[PDB]
TrEMBL record, chains B, D, E:
<feature type="binding site">
    <location>
        <position position="115"/>
    </location>
    <ligand>
        <name>S-adenosyl-L-methionine</name>
    </ligand>
</feature>
<feature type="binding site">
    <location>
        <position position="185"/>
    </location>
    <ligand>
        <name>Mg(2+) 1</name>
    </ligand>
</feature>
<feature type="binding site">
    <location>
        <position position="115"/>
    </location>
    <ligand>
        <name>S-adenosyl-L-homocysteine 3</name>
    </ligand>
</feature>
<feature type="binding site">
    <location>
        <position position="63"/>
    </location>
    <ligand>
        <name>S-adenosyl-L-methionine</name>
    </ligand>
</feature>
<dbReference type="InterPro" id="IPR007072">
    <property type="entry name" value="RNMT_CmcI"/>
</dbReference>
<feature type="binding site">
    <location>
        <position position="185"/>
    </location>
    <ligand>
        <name>Mg(2+) 2</name>
    </ligand>
</feature>
<feature type="binding site">
    <location>
        <position position="138"/>
    </location>
    <ligand>
        <name>S-adenosyl-L-methionine</name>
    </ligand>
</feature>
<dbReference type="InterPro" id="IPR029063">
    <property type="entry name" value="SAM-dependent_MTases_sf"/>
</dbReference>
<feature type="binding site">
    <location>
        <position position="159"/>
    </location>
    <ligand>
        <name>Mg(2+) 2</name>
    </ligand>
</feature>
<feature type="binding site">
    <location>
        <position position="94"/>
    </location>
    <ligand>
        <name>S-adenosyl-L-methionine</name>
    </ligand>
</feature>
<feature type="binding site">
    <location>
        <position position="64"/>
    </location>
    <ligand>
        <name>S-adenosyl-L-methionine</name>
    </ligand>
</feature>
<feature type="binding site">
    <location>
        <position position="186"/>
    </location>
    <ligand>
        <name>Mg(2+) 2</name>
    </ligand>
</feature>
<feature type="binding site">
    <location>
        <position position="64"/>
    </location>
    <ligand>
        <name>S-adenosyl-L-homocysteine 1</name>
    </ligand>
</feature>
<feature type="binding site">
    <location>
        <position position="137"/>
    </location>
    <ligand>
        <name>S-adenosyl-L-homocysteine 2</name>
    </ligand>
</feature>
<feature type="binding site">
    <location>
        <position position="137"/>
    </location>
    <ligand>
        <name>S-adenosyl-L-homocysteine 3</name>
    </ligand>
</feature>
<keyword id="KW-0949">S-adenosyl-L-methionine</keyword>
<feature type="binding site">
    <location>
        <position position="186"/>
    </location>
    <ligand>
        <name>Mg(2+) 3</name>
    </ligand>
</feature>
């Protein structure tokens, strides 16, 4: 009856993201927010709403969860990066977070976000000091040429996962110095599950130039086995 | 420095599929195939290889796992379908299974397979009986308008998950008769997770045409609340 | 009261078997079969019925569950047995299954079922091509003498668990050839549990003639640690 | 070789019971008993032997585990039974436990065990005070009906599982008074798995005479849903 | 044998805190920090060190774990407190965090720590902007009187848990305005476990003045059922 | 209202013990005691009450759970101790138990209990045979000095945890002989979590005098890695 002349959107677009880049607080449905203390023991114990992607940072959605934030905090504190690069931006929450966190730490850090599509970015123009947004394209490597001009140390973070190994070869040869991080969030465990032989070969090809950092690599489900850095040349 | 001269295939292409459409028997790494019986108790208890998609049917890879296979066995025995349609073929294992199973049940069933790329299908020529392949895109409703007429009852299976709700729409107005299935494997639970609001509106738009068949919808992790059918 | 009336069957007779050897599909008792799509998310998430042995093959009950079926399929495809023997028949579901699967693979296989009690066999006589039943007592080795006439490779399957180790001893001495399987379903983990010393001694006495096939021994809970085959002398 | 030297006993005889009715203390195989304290963190953290039936009472094996022991303790304290009956004996560990436990609690209680085979009973002749052994067949009610006029309250325990629904009918009419227990240990969950319809129908038949004691029925896995008592 | 030479500090002093108020980075103990990529699949998958209280903020230990930090983040953003009070200080790590997180948010917030022992504090005098440390006793209630004269909204956090119920009475009667929070961290699940009736009675006494806030109360294991506020 | 005119006990007093040293049977709250057998399958499958310390012994509260009781039984059966010392008494439940058990075993055993506060003891003097009680602080070694000559073999059990290592040193030097046990219930795993470095130093300082009995050390969650005795290697 109601499926009539409707163009149904492709729900695959909202994968790992959600419907809305803007942040809205969770709302309770099956209980009152103000539970009475005389009935305190009868109150339900579950969260009350979806824990899909519930985190925020100053009113922007944060796709990086608390355990991941904790790892990056330690990494920032130890490395004191002059440059953090995000390939894959979405709403920009994690950019502002990296910027904020580096400011509180007293680290002179320029944060850079690269994406094919920047139209979902929720960072207001007034809150953009030391955050630069570049419109790029993973399959074209000359995109990345800009900002070999940038300062070190440097953390390069892949959240896009398109031409990753090629981008890695570029970064190793043209960008990273010893100590710099190249990080692949989320995807490495899935590539190993689906393509165990090719994955092991491809990662293994970078063994003279990149190490898995074992202090951080097992510390969150999002960074699981994906934290690499440049070994001594 | 092997990264310097090396062709990096795009690894996302294998998502949900594997790296090779042809079947290869599992290989044991950290044990012998023959475990000595006087040390029986000290044998490892784990599988010995990855359980990603280790299933086969007659030398062809099978991406439908044993409990999914059992559900379809029951469905095919109840419904006695004269057509089965697979949106998404890959190596063709499931096509060959559906055809073999219906034949062994005594059921005259045509199996139809639709895919963007049929260059991966592994079904030997010598047994393509009652299988019809079609090459086409899912983002194109034209791929379905071109289909010739099919017998009933019918089962339509979505293993491709592109433009799925528009295809459901086309299927309800131009294909499905009362008692015919439209099954979305795998994806329903993810779509609810990622886009609960829109998923809900979309599914509920079919409230007067499709229902969820609770006999089968909770019977396997792959078919999990995705087995629908046409009600009067 | 209702109890003074009844006769009360021995419920131990249905151990591992169920009440009725004939197949009837599951039925939903506490929800509609057709759940409305506007309330999809409210739908109950559990199976809906008993998960004991709700399995079938062409309207006969299947006591071997899906994972077990998957192991036998790989085993049949690799080995291509000329003979499969089921010690312990019940309804014949696995007999019909084995025969159907070998026909589909183009294998010339004679399926043989041995039991003291053949009265629960549900296979129609019109559908007994390449299946043979045979009456016999497990403790009487005469029961198995006609097996020596059969072609190989051979898979011998114990679903009876009476006199098992003497039957194994006999199979090694008079029946089994290199490559043939001797398989004990279900019982071996229990025998190890209740009598670890005698069980380890008994199994280990076959160390020169049989081995545990580790490609199949861990692949199903029913076949768990019970898949054995004849090694080379 | 060795399989031909062997006289193979039937291992189904040992089901639920173990190989030897006499108690032997567990032994470590892959560690020293005395772990050096300077490598305390290196010590393995598993049990170190099989937990099939590791329990004992005063040198006799105990087939009832600590969780079950604790329920029977509370039940004895509340009910203060003059008689505890055990259908099925084995080594008599639980018979001696029931006796010793009622003695320290000050309860005057005769313990009676009944079995087809009493030759496995490990209880010393000179430690058999307030314990009676009775030979008899379960699928045959002459065993039960003759030996009677036992004092109340009463606890009747099934550890045999032979003709249980008929023994239950005999007990409600000719033995049990209000507040007495009839307990089926272990077997209730299996009869429900294998015969849901026949089992629900049979227990439902006793609806006006027995009930499930909910204070004790969920409190151990052996007693799981098998604690019944005589409500009038 | 140097048990008779050794001097034993009270290990109870470190319960829930650790040996050292100063932060030190985790030490890797049975693996290299740099795992070679040709052996990537063979790298161990566990953390590499103890997950006891491994967290930090800007070189200071953080006893509030990331899940709890996420809850307080939302709370600060929503409430926008002018005052945050921590009953129990230790190293000052969460004092510094609260202050930093409110500056970042553009909120004008004074942060206050109260403990009988402030000598474990690790915050340099360099950066005590909007942080005040007060010498306090949980048994004395004159201790808390300085808090009355300062701005709301207000979050009051008990990390000390001595004479808590009297402090909640004082706070309700003399401090908390509508909107303001009283948060007991960690202990409520334990008090209810050990003292269900007395705890239910005691919490029950605040039914007209405080309510449990279900948005934040189940969102972390440290705040579990302990987030209360002056409302209703 | 009720809060402002209510006297609040310090709830930390009850940590690890409960509100009442006297035993009260559990009580069903949301179901009838007697469930009807026509609705047997529809019966709830959980305990129906709180499992904090539901355990008793002859009308006295038991804080040691059944698993711990089974270990101590085996310990008593093998060691056949003449003395059993409990540091920590609370209600005396365990004292009455140890005494009863040794008596039923034929073991002539004196049970000693030590606590700063004996006022919660619930054991009737009518059954106080072979039970001695002392009043004293643990933080004072004098409490252990004033103890008389005790018979061996011996089990010394710590349930108080106040100055455990100096008490251990006093035990080893002045009390324990070949075979005697020193057991620390509950606390060892917490000291190891909160202070791994200082705990490993202190325990390993007894490496010549005490050793962890592996037959019992892993046999219960309460006695976990805390069962020590004066034996070599």
């Amino acid at each position: 009856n109601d499926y009539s002349r409707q163009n149904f959107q492709d729900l695959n677009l909202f994968r790992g993201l959600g419907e809305d880049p803007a942040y809205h607080p969770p709302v309770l449905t099956d209980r009152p927010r103000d539970w009475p203390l005389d009935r305190w023991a009868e109150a339900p114990r579950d969260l009350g709403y979806s824990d899909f992607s519930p985190y925020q940072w100053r009113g922007l959605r944060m796709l990086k969860d608390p355990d991941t934030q904790a790892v990056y905090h330690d990494m920032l504190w130890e490395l004191r990066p002059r440059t953090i690069v995000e390939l894959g931006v979405y709403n920009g929450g994690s950019l502002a977070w990296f910027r904020d966190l580096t400011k509180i730490m007293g680290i002179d850090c320029q944060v850079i976000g690269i994406d094919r599509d920047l139209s979902r970015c929720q960072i207001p123009a007034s809150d953009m000091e030391n955050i630069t947004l570049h419109q790029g394209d993973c399959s074209d490597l000359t995109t990345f040429e800009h900002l070999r001009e940038m300062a070190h140390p440097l953390i390069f973070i892949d959240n896009a996962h398109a031409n990753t190994f090629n981008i890695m070869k570029w970064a190793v040869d043209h960008l990273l110095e010893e100590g710099d991080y190249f990080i692949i969030e989320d995807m490495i465990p899935y590539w190993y599950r689906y393509a165990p032989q090719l994955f092991s070969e491809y990662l293994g090809a970078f063994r003279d130039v990149l190490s898995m950092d074992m202090l951080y690599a097992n510390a969150s489900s999002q960074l699981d086995r994906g934290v690499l850095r440049r070994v001594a040349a």
